Amino acid sequence: SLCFKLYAKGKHEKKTWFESRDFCRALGGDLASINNKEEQQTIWRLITASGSYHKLFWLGLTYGSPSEGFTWSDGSPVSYENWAYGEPNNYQNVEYCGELKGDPTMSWNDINCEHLNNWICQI
Ligand SMILES: OC[C@H]1O[C@H](O)[C@@H](O)[C@@H](O)[C@@H]1O
Ligand SMILES: [Ca+2]
Ligand SMILES: [Ca+2]
Predict the structure, then answer these.
(1) Among candidates 46, 78, 45, 47, which has minimal Cα distance to 61?
(2) Could you say which DSSP state residue 120 is in?
(3) Ligand found nearest the CA of 61
(4) N or C: which terminus of the chain has fewer CB atoms within 10 Å of its end residue's CB?
């Protein structure tokens, strides 16, 4: 079993999706995968425990292909989904990575992978 770890930082420490993935892998883990409602509840509870409200976080979500759909960087299946209303929308055709809106709904949005965000590792 892995443990989720929140990285909620100021703009100077925020990372692109690829930088966040590489950071978590350097620690022996990966960006967090949310494969069912239970994992989602674990992360929400972790958000409440740290008081890290009103934040956006990279998850391990990245677009694969038409025959795969989205994928998790850790290789686990994208069975469960929790996209926000109207998402994923591939806005302007440049959104290939997934972020978590860290409020009680725990919804996902696709966004440009070069955006600087907070992130969640599984270690
Ligand atoms: O900033 C990009 C972001 O803008 C809006 O919130 C929506 O269109 C989202 O779907 C999109 O990902
Ligand atoms: Ca998982
Ligand atoms: Ca989007």
Answers:
(1) 78
(2) E
(3) 2
(4) N
Report which protein residue has its CA nearest ligand 1's atom 1: 111
Q: Which atom of ligand 1 is nearest to the CA of 95?
A: 12
Q: Give the tokens for residue 93.
A: 């055709």
Residue with token string 């674990």: 42
Rounded (10°) CA dihedral 17, 19, 20, 24: 140
101 alpha carbon to ligand 3 midpoint, in Å? 12
**How many CB atoms lie under 10 A from the CB of residue 105?**
12
Q: Report the residue among 93, 94, 111 best suited for mutation to probe ligand 1: largest number of ligand atoms under 8 A from its CB.
A: 111
Q: Which residues pair with 31 in a beta bridge?
A: 121
DSSP string for residues in 35-74: -SHHHHHHHHHHHHHHT--S-EEEEEEEEEETTTEEEETT
Residue 45 CA to chain centroid, in angstroms? 16
Residues with CB under 6 A from ligand 1: 87, 89, 91, 95, 109-111
Say how many CA atoms lie within 13 Å of 55 toward its Cβ.
Answer: 24
